[PDB]
């Protein structure tokens with residue numbers, strides 16, 4: 001494990017400026033990094049974990065989080081260990097994908113929806129290749145770097161209030177977490193995207209979820225989803241973990257759909273919605289996204 005990928009910060013080097021939100025593991029702040037001797041203030045994201053393990057143990061798993069290198073996975077950049085644990089990552093002005101699809105509920109075309117599914121599956125496939133299990137995949141944990149480029153965040157924060165409605169049944173009943181339970185959570189994530197950010201099992205108590213799942217009930221077909229798309233989601237929620245799709249296969253299936261998007265999603269006014277022109281993509285990347293990344297899938 002290359003320790004050069006993780007910078008240890010002193011509390012004087014940075015400052016938390018504004019709360020962006022919180023979850024089961026901590027509170028996220030927009031912050032500023034001031035490099036020693038410089039007068040510039042560089043925006044960063046800072047997550048202060050709630051618990052506040054020995055430092056060496058934490059630091060050991062931080063190195064792993066800092067070692068991920070994939071265009072669709074957020075890398076841990078720095079850490080500050082004191083009376084609390086603070087994690088430094090790149091700040092994402094657009095915020096999480098869950099908020100984004102809610103705010104653009106009437107502006108989002110099939111090409112974006114299907115490409116996001118592809119990118120999320122690419123990020124998860126990379127984690128599986130690293131033999132790393134996420135355990136907390138959800139639309140709230142996908143960040144928008146640009147509308148054309150999303151990234152998975154917060155994998156393995158357990159190491160270092162359980163999300164029952166995203167969890168595989170075997171995780172609920174037995175706290176077993178695997179790549180195939182990550183696939184279940186991927187299914188729920190895709191459902192959140194396709195419903196433009198609806199809450200899964202709305203109005204149903206968390207305590208009743210396992211019995212509902214055992215009865216064979218699942219999240220309902222989203223109004224924009226054709227049966228082929230919905231069957232993929234349903235396959236992610238099969239009781240037998242090994243009969244669920246693999247992330248490798250999901251990349252291929254959603255990439256195929258992205259090439260003929262109106263055949264797979266039905267969205268009012270979809271023809272009036274395209275992926276950005278080369279001109280607009282070039283501008284976005286120049287200003288916000290210089291990193292390398294696979295081409296988005298365009299319609300045939």
Ligand SMILES: Nc1ncnc2c1ncn2[C@@H]1O[C@H](COP(=O)(O)OP(=O)(O)NP(=O)(O)O)[C@@H](O)[C@H]1O
Pocket residue numbers: 020021022023024025026027028045047089090091092093095096099136138140141143153154163
């Ligand atoms: N790097 C970031 N840049 C900008 N906003 C961020 C960043 N990381 C997190 N956020 C936002 O901060 C919110 C709170 O994050 P977080 O503490 O990870 O809780 P959560 O992901 O929503 N739920 P949980 O699954 O329990 O961690 C997220 O939902 C995002 O909206």
Ligand SMILES: [Mg+2]
Pocket residue numbers: 023140141153154
């Ligand atoms: Mg999160």
